[PDB]
């Protein structure tokens, strides 16, 4: 649909933080739409890029891809501007065929969105314990 | 046996510190069980890995191996997160044959556990004086 | 944690279907835990594989990876057993560094779990309209 300010709520370890993302256009070279947090510093923005890919003569499948990039800043003694210490990434790729109905795709999407709240996933992502 | 929280007591130069270690699963690739301190920072954890090794066509002996890794953190002026300055290691390997009884193995284990409290060893490990 | 049946609820286009997944062990060759639907046919199972990866001398980052595979069956006139016509895939990879706290990782996880319910994502995944 149309790009708009996505204001996601109830985020975090406790569940009280919010994240508002402003749209920043669609890249014409590769068809990748971008959104970022209004933090006003071009290196310290939490950003989300979403792009759907048409079929070619080499893929023949629809490919949806979502990337989330979150950098962490730190102030320094030796400089007055903060720098990027580390970044956290997330990369989701859906691959659907040329005959799939929308019920199957909504089942995959809601299965992933409900499976990222399981105790298995909140123990394997947060505390990094293998499933055992 | 079953992995469990090993809460070792009376540790240190004076003998009053305790160390509680939580289990973090068994690595399926090489059969190495891990335990670590609940310090909640994935780089600043004191960790202990124990693994027993079955005989192969190249070793034909049972091999028990215990590793202890203790990193030391330091805060910095220039960053807000602490980093690892140095690490202390320990590596114990027991090698038993295919005909050894359990009394011999308990003799080796308790000999090492009582020999790590001798004045020779607490002078050679703590103060790093050669035996002379 | 430990593998156990994961009975996910309120799934689908309408929001009323449930999916119960039974654990089927951990692969020792690569450390990939598997779960699948109890559909009793080994080719028609909706399956989910989750695996976390330790650092090596070539990656030096923790890598969590989740795969979802959903096949669709169809009966045939010419055979008595159903076959797999097509499959729907999903592949999520989290890449965290060696100094990240758990609040940042929970922020990434809950950001993705709340961002898969936005109108942008339910219009780009379901109806396949570009943004």
């Amino acid at each position, epitope marked *: 649909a149309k790009l708009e300010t996505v204001t996601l709520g109830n985020i975090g370890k406790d569940g009280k933080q919010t994240l508002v993302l402003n749209p920043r256009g669609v890249n014409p070279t590769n068809g990748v739409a971008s959104l970022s947090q209004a933090g006003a510093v071009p290196a310290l923005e939490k950003r989300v890029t979403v792009s759907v890919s048409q079929p070619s003569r080499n893929r023949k499948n629809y490919k949806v891809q979502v990337k989330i990039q979150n950098p962490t800043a730190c102030t320094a003694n030796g400089s007055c501007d903060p720098s990027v210490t580390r970044q956290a990434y997330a990369d989701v790729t859906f691959s659907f065929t040329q005959y799939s109905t929308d019920e199957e795709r909504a089942f995959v999407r809601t299965e992933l969105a409900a499976l990222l709240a399981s105790p298995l996933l*909140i123990d394997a992502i947060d505390q990094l*314990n293998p499933a055992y | 046996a079953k992995l469990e929280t090993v809460t070792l007591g009376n540790i240190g130069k004076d003998g009053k510190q305790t160390l509680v270690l939580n289990p973090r699963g068994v690595n399926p690739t090489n059969g190495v069980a891990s335990l670590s301190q609940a310090g909640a920072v994935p780089a600043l954890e004191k960790r202990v890995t124990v693994s027993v090794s079955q005989p192969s066509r190249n070793r034909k002996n049972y091999k028990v191996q215990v590793k202890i890794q203790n990193p030391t953190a330091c805060t910095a002026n220039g960053s807000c997160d602490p980093s690892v300055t140095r690490q202390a290691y320990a590596d114990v390997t027991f090698s038993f044959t295919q005909y050894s009884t359990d009394e011999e193995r308990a003799f080796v284990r308790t000999e090492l556990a009582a020999l790590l409290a001798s004045p020779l060893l607490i002078d050679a490990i703590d103060q790093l004086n050669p035996a002379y | 944690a430990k593998l156990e049946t994961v009975t996910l*609820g309120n799934i689908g286009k309408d929001g009323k279907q449930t999916l119960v997944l039974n654990p089927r062990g951990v692969n020792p060759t690569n450390g990939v835990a598997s779960l699948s639907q109890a559909g009793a046919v080994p080719a028609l199972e909706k399956r989910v594989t989750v695996s976390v990866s330790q650092p090596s001398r070539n990656r030096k980052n923790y890598k969590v990876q989740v795969k979802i595979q959903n096949p669709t069956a169809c009966t045939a006139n010419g055979s008595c057993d159903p076959s797999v016509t097509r499959q729907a895939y999903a592949d999520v990879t989290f890449s965290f560094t060696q100094y990240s706290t758990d609040e940042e990782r929970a922020f990434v996880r809950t950001e993705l779990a709340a961002l898969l319910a936005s109108p942008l994502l339910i219009d780009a995944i379901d109806q396949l309209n570009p943004a």
Partner: antibody
Amino acid sequence: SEVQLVESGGGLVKPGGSLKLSCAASGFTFSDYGMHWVRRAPEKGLEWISYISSGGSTIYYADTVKGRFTISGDNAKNTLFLQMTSLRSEDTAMYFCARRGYDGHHYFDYWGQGTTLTV
Amino acid sequence: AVVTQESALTTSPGETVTLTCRSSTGAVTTSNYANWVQEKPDHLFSGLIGGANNRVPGVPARFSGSLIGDKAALTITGAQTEDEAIYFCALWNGSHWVFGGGTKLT
């Protein structure tokens, strides 16, 4: 709506074993729900006993109990079993049953009313 | 988290109040799936608030779960007179669920 009730059992059993707790589920089915057992000692706090999950594939048995209780389910008539072999020392409780809900959702959400089983 | 503990405080009807649930060994985390149980004094229990933020359908809107600090919290906004009960806590320590003592809200 959905009302649970546990009534089977509650006799003055000698310390030898051989009793059965059972509850009947009304507003749901055991296809996508699991059931807990908790144990309120007559003046202490609650204590979790055991759990079968949805469909009966993962069973736990907290380690004061494992070996001498058995929990099972019977999908005909929608009932939930609890069959032991010994009643050793205390085992005095209003035994409640909980209905572990959906997986991202609440895990002790629609309770029973308890049966007093004295040894 | 082999044992857990909380207080037995009380409050007036005319403003908010919080309830902590402190794990004895270390801190609570996301893996400690913390959810709350409400007991009306006919020993009629009820599920109150799920693990992350969730509520049981039927629980009113003046109820929120938290991870304030190192303790699983329970914020009741404008506590009226009908929830004059005792509240129970729960943690999964990796092997078995652990319930705590009550909190006699009056």
